[PDB]
């Protein structure tokens, strides 16, 4: 039943007695459910060290991964270019997922097409799907560029993208001058961040490989910036802001922040802003190119160093105090522009906040996951705050990366309890936070089911989730935040210390039991 | 708009297409005539999508894993292939359930074989056999496994049926192979059929020679209710207040045991015709169980369905039915009295999957709103057979609408509210058009039944009449 | 006892059994405590409507006020001027409290002096304290200006500030030209916002009253901006940011954002930035003067309109969408500068955020308190989101202000359940949130004890606190945030909607009980 | 630093002052000589503050309401006067207690008469009487009321003593008028004395003719421990493990009944001599109860204090004393072993109120640290008598130090760590000098007792050795 003036949605509607009674009869009558004693016994077992050893012995089963497949990153890369339509050669289901995945994180429209290869294309290949697809895409949505990626189906059958695209132009489906860069993005290699790298290299190749005769390094007095797979709008904005602060000429290659934050003013803008074709074609003339996330831009690095002949600097992701310092100093050296007083002040204010909140952060133990560059940067900043990263998981990380993070941990007393895991998933981490419990997790929305599991053992075992990463589906507008630079470090710090103080306030909220420590001032 | 004007809008929109696509899309756009009984001569459906036009359709894996199999709570479903499918479909659909997640229920988890290149080159059948063992060790309370094939499994040619047979026999466990690769079919709809056949071939018949269940004349099954926001629960309670015994729910909050029991029921109550008519026809053909279509959207349809269902039994069920109707009569009348004045005359366009584009119409008319345009992603012609009588004359129908068509239709028709999916929602909010998600219910619901009508009405009012929609134009602009 | 590798602080140390047993023996032996049944019976009584009726009949007792005294605002006002030392004529205990109060909110040094009047001044007056204090303060801390306010001691005894300062200059304790503006700030009149007004009008008079002859309105082509009592650094910065964006020449009068955010770079800066004396002297030459918080700048308005002859526009505090729109339109009108494209886009991105989150915000019920201009601006924005302000409390509000807020509520359907309270305290509001329970409170740190009380009645009765206002003592670095303009509107909206979702996630975290509604996507 | 260099430092700092202030402040600065017993010849204290030099002192209202009376939990304390004092002092001091706040305990609440101009002109005595009735109505479980006078009460000529007598007789309730107006005295110190006389005159003697309390030979009272972060609890547990019965705590977590029961104890244990020695002497003179000063900061002082207290009783108490020391010996030795190597040789400068500037030196010394400078806001010369034997030779002493002085001393002395109050903390963190709040314990603690020493060491290590302090200089500077 419903009270018209106090309507109940699913929660707490199904807690009404008649619904409880109905659901009990459904279970007892027809579900043949395991006894609650057995369920309780098995759950307790899944929290044990005995279970953890069996868990980490997995060789074939994956449970709750922390990564996505290549074309997702290729799509995000393509979105950063002016009037460009992402186009995934293969089966249409993939695009339906890519768009929905990004729709729910950014709460914005995400445009992307498929050429809808079906079982017919499985036998004869998808050349006809590409011909008609490019013509239909260009006529209907009128992009200035189509950037092509692939689904696994097209990769398995081995479609020749270069041949298909050439034939579309030779047979008149799309003008020969119309730009159609492409990249093979097999989902069974790497992860979503590999697709971003592959797509970017494919676009950079398209506009520069056959036009390197007239290029002179340093001739346009700019620095190229490659952001990589980036899902915080603030991270695009803070980089552009700091470079404008120093008066550094720059070119951000792949810039979706305009198209992922269009105003709601009565009209839908399919395209907005983005890196121009002119900026790619001119990019070799820059002083140098900086890769903001080098650990998934290695194929881009090889091309930029091998073809543009840029001396790509050895820089970490600019997260935390030390690595933002090194970023600005390297930029200053390449451009010849000095670090202004306004950034030196912003830096000192971050230090001030670190001194203002160092006692509450000291010694706190964290489990964290995400993409490689994000993760190490987060580990670096946690060490700078005097926190203890304990469980560090990077499902799409490699041995080379692990060694580099282990070295960072070895260089700080606060890393003595850390372990770096690669190729492990969020069911592995769940066991870790039961057997070697930290104070918090730092991860994406998928971590909420780990917090649910921990609380079910008992309130004292609960590991609260702090939401930093991708995807974040169950909070609104966190994609607007920042994690790079001093500004991002400032926001992370405020999040960590206030998450800690929120949890303390909950634990000391019981009157005459724990509220002796329910201080007004912290 | 007049019939001729709607026909002009269709033709004007089609001008932008190349000749090949223009010829096809014209067959998928029509001006409704409620008198027609064979929709095939006004509109074509269930055909391949034209490449590069931004269809809203998904794949067959979505229709099998995401829709039919995934909700089944006490089995573990393996997304077999590379990491993408299982991640993007992890917990996106609000098929609700009661269980201990990770112990005896596994709906919101993502089990996958995470194919790497080595598995593409040499095949995944050895990995799948090992994967099955590992599942059995770490999740001993599972009651069955299904293997949801992703695109490469059929391309690589792996033989998951043999693995399921061998491992199912070895471990005395039900292991269901599903050939729902995304390159099959043209939409989610073939996923339904593949999944229905997998239920038929590997699960449904296990209790054929088992007589253990004591049936009564009032045993039914809810077929094709996936419990979005609890829909099936607010439907089940009404059926059992009426005196019927719901043996099973297919498949929202569904257990494998209550699937195996379904051939024992006396009547199959079909909500989603599109995805579940296949198994219904099979159970009529094999067990002699009749099935009927019903509708629990809005009081008018709910009352019509309760009475139509009760008529299939005896006087006692019919007496209880009128007691159910009398009980809730003040409730939904209060909802109408509150909200219909806030919504009378508002015009709404819908674009959903295979049922709701016609099935929620009566609910909107119960609040005095008019459905001026509707369509499906993947419905067949027997869905459009059931739609044209439900829509007003000279309204607009669109099958597998493209992004460009939908935006342009909306610009012309200027609806007061749009009901569609997540890939459409934020486009139309930017244009200043109230939008309600009619897949996920915008994280609200249930909408089925009497209790759901109250939430549906509240939701449509909150969004349509929200203050935010009056503020999009800056006062200096 | 303690384990050296897991040292426990007061929580959870005193939950150890030997401490529990000890405190039990302490209670039963010597505290003559009321029986727990009586304590529970009386608490339940304090949650009833019967108790609320007695509660609201109070005429003499105040409990848990939501205001402070005048000189606290006078100090904050003084801090916003270049190299200015706040100086409170009166007793030194007041200054020790003003400094600690601001120290805990800003987590920054706060400088302010007293002349330490003692009991002899009750009979003889405190002229000698002013003489030696002004000389001592100038010589020791070398301010360019000393701004004088008063404690209630100096006000009751009736010290003549003008005579004391004039005699100090006559006799050579300070140079005759050294600027010593002053204002009488009786703590038994108004509240801290009244003291801000008094001090600002006193400073403005000092630099302009006797030099009006050569002043010409509009001759310097600027707009004067008076922020009022303001404790969010972002609010000073956001106003300066938008005005620079439009290229509008301005002068922010009282600007403490530099001194309340100095970098930790090895040196302590007593003074930093601030409004210059030349900006005060030149202020009458502005095009006009805008008051950001007009409901506690009434004395300033009278002087600016009466002496400077500026036609101060009737603007509300720029909070929310409508009132930020109006502010920018009025500045555009006075300055002749168009609203640039960048600010039109920012507005449209705020509108988008409102459309993205409207479903979770609709109908949500709030109790809120704070200062008049902040409270009414928050009430306006909650209405713009489709929220229901239910209990609106402004301890230091007046009849006229109440009349203005009631009209705003009368213009919107979401104000049908609202009640505006003036002169009531947080013990009044505690009864309201028991008898007419809202979903959340929006207030300062003192609201945390209301949440404790409600939870004690039961988890279903708990009203969580959202921390917006002043002071905020139990979280770190929220003083850096913003509430004004579109930027502030986006921050308030993000905080509200995500507070709603955090509470939902907690209410649906119970496995097999309420986690059916523990959705991944919201 | 030699004496000739510290003396030169003092003189160099004083050159900034005008002659009058220079001559006075010189008397309040000294270079320590541990042999001195008559400190009045080396340093002057408990004098008025020089106007306009940014003293860190508070007022007598702080010493009475904030320090002595406020902690009493089952009483309601009225901040009588304008709204300021009661709001800035609301829940700023972490005097911890066990109770149900708003029902039977009231520490963190701010009761005030909120004076307006009408109350200044006509007086507040009528308002006070009405406020007491309203307290009685809305807070029925309060066991007594106190009236903490703010500055205007005395100047306005109000007679709160007559109100308390008349209303206390009418309602049969203990109502204590306290004349702690902030213009009285020169600091918080006179507030201690006024409050102590109020306890004496209105509360302490109420059970003089009541002999129903069952005494034992081991009854003691903890006098002058305000339970900052739980200090008094972690001291009480040791005394009771020693075999003593702690009848009362003044005033941390203290109830009005345990105060009324204190004249029945056998020995008064005084921690804070500054704030509570007045009532101690009065209780010796009137009831014949001896008192002793003790120190529970750090293991060395705690062991010496425990043994000194036990010696005042029989052989059985002394036996439990040595058993207590043996139990906790491995615990504090483990704290020393871990943290002393991280802190050995580090130099500390302190500036606090009236006890801790000498009381915590032994705790620092147990960790191998050296207190190179200390001082008090408001101590008297008998506090400095007890200090100089506890400080190293040629260290720096400062009474009622000014903001300018303190910064200049620190710039020259360059300590590794400073311990002071909230008004000091953020100055020296900008300077890159680790800082610990030694009033609030930086929202940590307890520091008293053996369990407090473990926390004390952890806090000093975490702050002094924190990585943030290595980062203040930009690498390009
Ligand atoms: S009801 Fe079902 S997920 Fe049958 S819950 Fe879902 S509008 Fe899908 S495949 Mo959204 S069983 Fe309908 C469906 Fe199909 S919301 Fe629509 S498209 S034909
Ligand atoms: S003197 Fe001591 S820290 Fe006994 S230095 Fe400190 S005005 Fe505290 S607990 Mo501030 S030993 Fe007094 C004190 Fe207590 S300044 Fe006051 S409140 S009763
Ligand atoms: Fe949006
Ligand atoms: Fe700070």
Numbering used by the authors:
A (entry chain B), C (entry chain D): 2 to 523
B (entry chain A), D (entry chain C): 4 to 480
Sentences from the study reporting this entry:
The fixation of kinetically inert atmospheric dinitrogen (N2) to ammonia (NH3) is catalyzed in some specific microbes by a single family of enzymes known as nitrogenases, with turnover frequencies of around one N2 fixed per second and a second-order rate constant of ∼104 M–1 s–1 (kcat/KM).1−6 The Mo-dependent nitrogenase consists of an N2-reducing molybdenum-iron (MoFe) protein and a corresponding reductase called the iron (Fe) protein. The MoFe protein is a ∼230 kDa (αß)2 heterotetramer (NifDK), where each αß half contains an electron-transferring [8Fe–7S] P cluster and a [7Fe–9S–C–Mo]/homocitrate FeMo cofactor (FeMoco). The Fe protein is a homodimeric NifH2 protein of ∼66 kDa containing a single [4Fe–4S] cluster and two MgATP binding sites. The substrate-reducing proteins of all nitrogenases (MoFe, VFe, and FeFe) are organized as α2ß2(γ2) multimers with two functional halves.
To achieve this, we employed a MoFe protein mutant possessing a single solvent-exposed Cys residue in proximity to the P cluster (α-C45A/L158C, NifD = α); this mutant was previously employed to conjugate a Ru-based photosensitizer in the place of the Fe protein, enabling photo-excited electron transfer to the P cluster. X-ray crystallography confirms the solvent accessibility (albeit somewhat geometrically hidden) of this cysteine residue. The α-L158C mutation is positioned at the Fe protein-binding interface on the MoFe protein. Residue α-L158 is located at the Fe:MoFe protein interface, and we therefore hypothesized that the functionalization of a Cys residue in this location with a steric inhibitor could prevent access of the Fe protein (and, therefore, nitrogenase catalysis). The structure was refined to a resolution of 3.03 Å and contained 2 MoFe proteins in the asymmetric unit. The cell dimensions did not fit any of the previously solved structures and might be due to the introduced mutations that impacted the crystal packing. The α-C45A/L158C MoFe protein was found to overlay well with high-resolution structures previously reported for wild-type MoFe protein from A. vinelandii, suggesting a minimal impact of the introduced mutations on the overall conformation of the MoFe protein. Despite the rather low resolution, some distinct changes in the rotamers of amino acids around the introduced mutations were also observed, once again being consistent with the mutations having been successfully introduced. Importantly, the P cluster and FeMoco of the α-C45A/L158C MoFe protein were both found to be present and intact. A Strep-inhibition reaction was performed on a larger batch of α-C45A/L158C MoFe protein (∼18 mg of Strep-inhibited protein obtained) to evaluate Michaelis–Menten kinetic parameters and the distribution of electrons toward N2 fixation under a range of N2 partial pressures.
